[PDB]
Amino acid sequence: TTALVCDNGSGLVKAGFAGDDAPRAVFPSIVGRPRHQGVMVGMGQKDSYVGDEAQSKRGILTLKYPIEHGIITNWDDMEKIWHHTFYNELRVAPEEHPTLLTEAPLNPKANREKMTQIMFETFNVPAMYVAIQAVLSLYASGRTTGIVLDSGDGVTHNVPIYEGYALPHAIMRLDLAGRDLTDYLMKILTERGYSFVTTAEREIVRDIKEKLCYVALDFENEMATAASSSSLEKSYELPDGQVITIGNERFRCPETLFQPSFIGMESAGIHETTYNSIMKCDIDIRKDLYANNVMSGGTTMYPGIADRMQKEITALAPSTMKIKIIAPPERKYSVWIGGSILASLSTFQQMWITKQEYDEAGPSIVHRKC
Amino acid sequence: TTALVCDNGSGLVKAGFAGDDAPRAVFPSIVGRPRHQGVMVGMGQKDSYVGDEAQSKRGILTLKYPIEHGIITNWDDMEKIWHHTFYNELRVAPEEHPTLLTEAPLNPKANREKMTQIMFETFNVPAMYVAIQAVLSLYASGRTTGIVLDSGDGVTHNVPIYEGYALPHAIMRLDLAGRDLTDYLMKILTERGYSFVTTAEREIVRDIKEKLCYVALDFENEMATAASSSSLEKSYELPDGQVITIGNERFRCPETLFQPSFIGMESAGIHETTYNSIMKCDIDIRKDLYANNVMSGGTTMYPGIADRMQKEITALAPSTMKIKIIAPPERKYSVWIGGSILASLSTFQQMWITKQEYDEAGPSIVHRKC
């Protein structure tokens, strides 16, 4: 039988069969809970919706994410999501397929165990596995030398890899992502005169940041332009029918990535870490490492980000050294792309955790197979 | 079936066929040992590299030199090097070739024996022979009357030779070769602000002290010269991009050879032994020996030492004898150039140790062919 890969991040859980080059299902990992009193006995207002269909009927429920900043907070709802995946988007027996999961680095080990445990004793899958949510991304671009920056909606973590060997002593991690940007684009929106407070409204803002924002190749210069009369204004249309015009605050949202001072956090922007991570490595490494910055994650789909990141590095890296950002067009699925290639391999199918092994040593086994 | 000469110099090995006047392959004799955890399944990583290839991956490896001060202290590793020399550096099964080895004088007996016992058993070579790492240097320059002065990453020694006759009661020795100069330099390099600790860097200082040091024609004057700003300040560009400026400490490091008081060692520098060794010879020789010094080895490639000796000895020897420092500009391989000419010699095919002879005597037979 074939192997299953679902890279359940913080936003849209992705899942698909191995060997393929595009996941089968993509849907926002949300758990609907109706709140308003419903009075019609005929229609079956069920107990809790889940998935895009739940996303379809916003205004009636309480969109409550089960995953916050990489870690898992509430289990049962999360357990529904997996259960909604295997039986409605794939309709495949979990116990009849080896499965592979992904998860960011530097996460509470208590999360790992209670993940793989539920993977066995509630699905009886033949063998499961976790992996670094960044390493797979490198497998996607085929390289074996570079520094990932996968930052999709939950975290932002660079994991330098020189030649097949990781460098666990220089792997930064930043708790700042689109899920937090959305909130900022929600606050700054009130500046104009609009308002969005309920989670149903919140999901709308996320739909705006996607197709209206862009990263200023220079901040102070560009901001001064749209301050005076200019055509930086746009016009989005809410599902009600009215229209809003985000004039200036369309490039002030993603700018937060390069200046977390906008929400107070003391850490510096990613243009700092990515540099301030490399320097932790040795000296004979930095040459080619300075040249392969594979990116990933949804939060790296902003139009003008593939250039601000290059310019910033060159501003603090030694001049005679050359930098080159590698940004593939289908980065939005880079993680799941990689994970597919992993289980597709032949040398790798020995790494799994066989069911009997777990039954032999309990769930504490995975702490030696990361 | 031609003879084969592979000088096992304490720094970078030097090997090549007998007769031809140039060594085939040179590469720093090191052994790679990955130290950072490895997570990339499909990577074609080995367990331990060796050779200039293992020199290219200075980042992730860890370099354990197998030779120290002209003795062997890591056999298994050293075993790979010869193995890596014959097969993966020359592609010649050693059974079809009698070989020749080199080694410094006053070497611990237990070394020379074990060298043969390995060279015969685990390789099945027809005949093997180990010479003196100085006598060969003479036969390079053809002249059969001189006082060799070997050096370079390990030992430093002189061996007076009048007419094919050694003088075992006058051989000197010293553990003051380039290895510590590469090491001492990395000490006072801290003085400026830079620093290097990891053995991955210790192979970089060597790349500095190779092409940036020169021995002062007169020490004290040069100090006060470069003390006030002048044109001694040079630069060098690391393989990362940041550059350094070793202003003064480029003629202080290479000058340990003439004043071992810098690293505390007591025995005077080579500018005194080479005179002090001579006086241990008979009276009726010096009046000629003074005229023939033949430097050789990696250490004596400085724009300095090749000259300052001729100035220094004159301050010791009587002012009537004539001083002449032979110094051919290919000495960096002289130890192997000579070793080549000796195996191709015709009157020498008897002194070899036939595999036969080793059988009925064991390795102990080497102690009668030196």
Binding site: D21, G142, P328, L345 | M43, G44
Partner: peptide
Amino acid sequence: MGVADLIKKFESIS
């Protein structure tokens, strides 16, 4: 820019 099945076994481990 990339493909679905970039070289498998790529490093050719033995």
